[PDB]
Amino acid sequence: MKTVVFAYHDMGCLGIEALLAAGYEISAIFTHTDNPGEKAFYGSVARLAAERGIPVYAPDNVNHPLWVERIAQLSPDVIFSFYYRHLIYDEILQLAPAGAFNLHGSLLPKYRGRAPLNWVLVNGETETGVTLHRMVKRADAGAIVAQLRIAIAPDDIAITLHHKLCHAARQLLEQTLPAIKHGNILEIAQRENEATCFGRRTPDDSFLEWHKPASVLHNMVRAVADPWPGAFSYVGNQKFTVWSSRVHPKAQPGSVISVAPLLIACGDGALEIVTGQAGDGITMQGSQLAQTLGLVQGSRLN
Numbered sequence: 001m002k003t004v005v006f007a008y009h010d011m012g013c014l015g016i017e018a019l020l021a022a023g024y025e026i027s028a029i030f031t032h033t034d035n036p037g038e039k040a041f042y043g044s045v046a047r048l049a050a051e052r053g054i055p056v057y058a059p060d061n062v063n064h065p066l067w068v069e070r071i072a073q074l075s076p077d078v079i080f081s082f083y084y085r086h087l088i089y090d091e092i093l094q095l096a097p098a099g100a101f102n103l104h105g106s107l108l109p110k111y112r113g114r115a116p117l118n119w120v121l122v123n124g125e126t127e128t129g130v131t132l133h134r135m136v137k138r139a140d141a142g143a144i145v146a147q148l149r150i151a152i153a154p155d156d157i158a159i160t161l162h163h164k165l166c167h168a169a170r171q172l173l174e175q176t177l178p179a180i181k182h183g184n185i186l187e188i189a190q191r192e193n194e195a196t197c198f199g200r201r202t203p204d205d206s207f208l209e210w211h212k213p214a215s216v217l218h219n220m221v222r223a224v225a226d227p228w229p230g231a232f233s234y235v236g237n238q239k240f241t242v243w244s245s246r247v248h249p250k251a252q253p254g255s256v257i258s259v260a261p262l263l264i265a266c267g268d269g270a271l272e273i274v275t276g277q278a279g280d281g282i283t284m285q286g287s288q289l290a291q292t293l294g295l296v297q298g299s300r301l302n
């Protein structure tokens, strides 16, 4: 079976890895260029393809006609997206007779959209999953071919959850790809009244507002802990990042209760800044972070 593939990130790499094991011919892979703001810790889909002799591109707009045209000539039987970031129109999606699929890290139709890895940790979800589905004009909405559910633990952060999502993702593809290759899918439409959609995330989305409950602020620390861009606050004009934290069950919110442990009063309870860095400084424990910041007992953040 012949395939053209749209992939990036660790999921991109495992997807391609799974396609090749299961015995497909990946005729070409589309991907993206890396960006300076996003710590690139993950597998490179472009290195993967080169490694295996597959043609690889990263056009900013795959939906431009010339690209539609090169894709149509490759005669993809099936189309696979694994963690690609832009929409692929119905023109490219129609070109595959056996159809097109996407692999997505959520219990669809919950957490459609972007960065569900991170969104579920922000919202303090106790479980999540991986879904493989028909890829249609409308984002993350086509019929579900398979789904594997996995539990989020309280001590989990973005990096630990991501490796569980990838582990789950590879299994899903072992449990799915032969069936797709042979012509044997139970696809079920997604239930629209259950659906949720969460949008694009930026570093600025992890600003810490200390009027919130601590466990809310703690779940933001967890959702973008390193290698994500880190939840942050300010001391004066000084930005500083909270890399890891701990909820500790009469100081007003955003006030430094103690500086060792470095403990900030929130709206409800208190959050311990276990580790953090000031501006572009090195990472340190919280007691040291205070000293560098000039924080004292009773200091006010924004």
Ligand SMILES: N[C@H]1CO[C@H](OP(=O)(O)OP(=O)(O)OC[C@H]2O[C@@H](n3ccc(=O)[nH]c3=O)[C@H](O)[C@@H]2O)[C@H](O)[C@H]1O
Pocket (backbone or CB within 6 Å): 009, 037, 038, 039, 082, 083, 084, 085, 103, 104, 105, 113, 114, 115, 116, 117, 118, 119, 200, 201, 202, 203, 204, 205, 223, 224, 228, 229
């Ligand atoms: N099917 C979806 C599955 O999740 C992917 O998320 P993504 O890989 O993070 O990619 P993206 O949404 O584009 O977001 C990444 C950008 O967003 C930044 N980001 C991501 C999460 C977050 O919590 N904060 C943040 O700033 C990253 O640093 C980077 O700049 C894709 O959204 C879809 O493929």
Ligand SMILES: Cc1ccc(/N=C/[C@@H]2CNC3=NC(N)=NC(=O)C3N2C=O)cc1
Pocket (backbone or CB within 6 Å): 081, 083, 084, 085, 086, 087, 088, 089, 090, 093, 102, 103, 104, 113, 114, 135, 136, 137, 138, 139, 140, 141, 199, 200
């Ligand atoms: C705002 C936004 C923008 C893009 C997006 N997902 C893009 C990604 C990549 N390309 C896709 N192509 C198609 N035709 N359908 C999909 O569901 C797609 N996606 C599914 O993960 C999700 C939300």
